[PDB]
Design a protein around this ligand. Structure first.
Ligand SMILES: Nc1ncnc2c1ncn2[C@@H]1O[C@H](COP(=O)(O)OP(=O)(O)NP(=O)(O)O)[C@@H](O)[C@H]1O
Ligand SMILES: Nc1ncnc2c1ncn2[C@@H]1O[C@H](COP(=O)(O)OP(=O)(O)NP(=O)(O)O)[C@@H](O)[C@H]1O
Ligand SMILES: Cn1cnc2c(F)c(Nc3ccc(Br)cc3Cl)c(C(=O)NOCCO)cc21
Lengths: 277, 303
């Protein structure tokens, strides 16, 4: 009914909670001291006990994770109604902030390298049988060539969807969802029962690949309902309007494939990215 | 475009405009919830409707928002809601507008069973001329016509609100709320070029919903149509794009009304009736020359 932070391999004596790092739909993310750390405080309503019973299992799954491209999960303590997820602190900037900065230059070679790093981390998480299901440029950090993935698996227990018969969509969420997920969305759909898969995470990476070159999300102009229909029927943009070669456009064609089984695995995707100019 | 009684109160509105000056939060006392709130202004005796939209962004960007929002001080029409001012308080932008004691058309449709054809005629005329005013006088389209954005009052006038006057506010929106009722035109769902024709579709779909008392997509079966007299979001949107548009029952409504909504719900926006063609349609010529006490219907219907 509780998880102690003395159950963790990271030896824990004291934890200092600092300032808030930023605004976020899922809990509050504060600075921390352990070395500096990132503490995410969450509240559980003390209902769906069996769902948080699975939250504990998913957290213990994080314990077996360690990879240079995946944020170091360091511990988690649960004294209901309060939970806390403690991960290593990422210095640098989110890929969201980097991609939208005028001074930062993003040639084709660095975008190939940034993508390969995210693929390597996701390939590890898939090999360990872990689905990230909320891959965005706000959950990838970039510090002068160091690329780390963040917030994997949180979306299942997130509760970011919660009006009466009206589902909440944030700006960049829809364009990362594969068509099989988009066709499921409903005002009373919940994050725990959405058909996520390894193919859906590959689709989310395809969105990031578009974001790396266009340096903006796909379907930027259009409202949420138009995005839902266009993505559900399989309409997807390309990168030719900015002069990107076929090599860089084939990445999207494979990752954004309408049928799940046509999307490559991350190992195969790593091969594909190796063969770019 | 012309009337004297409508000019009588619109200039009196501009007499009440003098003491609005500038606005800040402490001027207001929360009266009730209608997110919008009915509020009591104390620097001037006006009771107002102040709408709060929660957005966080750098100062210069929302200053660009206010520059774009102050255009509403310029647009004045008996068919669009009047504008007081827009300030930024507590990280939530406020838009101060007329309080219309009748509410929106969706909650009065929730109050009534169905809305009769004669009232919907006057509603059609005012929405057409309101959109006409915006497009011809300010080069803007509404972009969000639906029953929840058409307001009524006990004086008897109806006005359009929540129309798109600012461009940066579109992008500045942090998120959006997508439910089971969608009023977006097919052409906008498919991401093609769109004009006021999309607002005409939204008007037509709003009219049929208010006429029958139910959101008309998907169409009801035979048993539900007699009694009147679990679907994902993508299934609805794909029904709007590919399946034939909704239509009124042929028994209880006049031909002029049925043809009017049919011309508004043509999928092809080039064939869809425009504001000018609607101004000539037989349905609104007939409705314009009718004696209907709209205030009497409202006050007796809502109570
Ligand atoms: N390890 C970390 N190092 C540095 N910043 C972090 C770290 N983890 C989270 N943050 C920041 O904390 C803030 C909130 O993060 P989060 O709750 O994940 O929301 P988000 O993913 O950025 N956007 P959203 O998905 O809509 O909630 C953001 O500014 C993140 O960049
Ligand atoms: N000037 C007004 N006078 C009276 N009621 C108003 C006025 N403006 C808004 N309202 C009320 O405010 C409610 C909410 O407004 P709004 O923010 O547009 O949400 P909504 O129209 O109901 N649905 P949505 O527009 O998709 O968020 C409406 O249902 C009206 O009842
Ligand atoms: C995108 N966008 C650009 N400009 C806008 C604008 F002015 C708006 N409001 C408005 C306009 C005129 C009058 Br008169 C009264 C109102 Cl309340 C809205 C709006 O009401 N969004 O509601 C979103 C859901 O909460 C949106 C705008």
């Amino acid at each position: 009914t509780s998880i102690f932070l003395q159950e963790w391999d990271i030896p824990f004596e004291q934890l200092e909670i600092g300032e808030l790092i930023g605004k976020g739909r899922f809990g509050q993310v504060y600075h921390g001291r352990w070395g500096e750390v990132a503490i995410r405080l969450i509240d559980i309503e003390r209902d769906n006990e069996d769902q948080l019973k699975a939250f504990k299992r998913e957290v213990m799954a994080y314990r077996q994770t360690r990879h240079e491209n995946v944020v170091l999960f360091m511990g988690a303590c649960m004294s209901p109604p309060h939970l806390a997820i403690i991960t290593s602190l990422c210095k640098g900037r989110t890929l969201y902030s980097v991609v939208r900065d005028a001074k930062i230059v993003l040639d084709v070679n660095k975008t190939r390298q940034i993508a390969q790093e995210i693929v390597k981390g996701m390939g590890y998480l898939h090999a360990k049988g872990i689905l990230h299901k909320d891959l965005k440029s706000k959950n990838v950090f970039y510090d002068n060539g160091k690329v780390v993935i963040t917030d994997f698996g949180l979306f299942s227990i997130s509760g970011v969807l919660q009006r009466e018969d009206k589902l909440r969509i944030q700006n960049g969420w829809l364009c990362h969802l594969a068509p099989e997920i988009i066709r499921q969305l409903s005002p009373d759909t919940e994050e725990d029962k959405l058909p996520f898969s390894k193919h859906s995470d590959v689709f989310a990476l395809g969105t990031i690949w578009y974001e790396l070159h266009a340096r903006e999300w796909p379907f930027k102009t259009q409202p949420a309902e138009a995005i839902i229909w266009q993505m559900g029927t399989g309409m997807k943009p390309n990168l030719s309007q900015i002069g990107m070669g076929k090599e860089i456009s084939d990445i999207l064609l494979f990752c954004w494939a309408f049928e799940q089984e046509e999307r490559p695995t991350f190992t195969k995707l790593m091969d594909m990215l190796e063969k770019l100019p | 475009e012309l009337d004297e009684q409508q000019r009588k109160r619109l200039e009196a509105f501009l007499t009440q405009k003098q003491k609005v000056g500038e606005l800040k939060d402490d001027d207001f006392e929360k009266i009730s919830e209608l997110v919008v709130f009915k509020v009591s202004h104390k620097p001037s005796g006006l009771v107002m409707a102040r709408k709060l939209i929660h957005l966080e962004i750098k100062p210069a960007i929302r200053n660009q928002i206010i520059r774009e929002l102050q255009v509403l001080h310029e647009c004045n029409s008996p068919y669009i809601v009047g504008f007081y001012g827009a300030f930024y308080s507590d990280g939530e932008i406020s838009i101060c507008m007329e309080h219309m004691d009748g509410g929106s058309l969706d909650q009065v449709l929730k109050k009534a069973g169905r809305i009769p054809e004669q009232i919907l005629g006057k509603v059609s005329i005012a929405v057409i001329k309101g959109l006409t005013y915006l497009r011809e006088k300010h080069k803007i389209m509404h972009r969000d016509v639906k029953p929840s954005n058409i307001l009524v009052n006990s004086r008897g006038e109806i006005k359009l609100c929540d129309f798109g006057v600012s461009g940066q506010l579109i992008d500045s929106m942090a998120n959006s709320f997508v439910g089971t009722r969608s009023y977006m035109s097919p052409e906008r769902l498919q991401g093609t070029h769109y004009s006021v024709q999309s607002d005409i579709w939204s008007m037509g779909l709003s009219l049929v919903e208010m006429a029958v008392g139910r959101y008309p997509i998907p169409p009801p079966d035979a048993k539900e149509l007699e009694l009147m007299f679990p679907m994902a979001i993508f299934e609805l949107l794909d029904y709007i794009v590919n399946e034939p548009p909704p239509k009124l029952p042929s028994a209880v409504f006049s031909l002029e009304f049925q043809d009017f909504v049919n011309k508004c719900l043509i999928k092809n926006p080039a064939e869809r009736a425009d504001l000018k063609q609607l101004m000539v349609h037989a349905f609104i010529k007939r409705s314009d020359a009718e004696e209907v006490d709209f205030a009497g219907w409202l006050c007796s219907t809502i109570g």
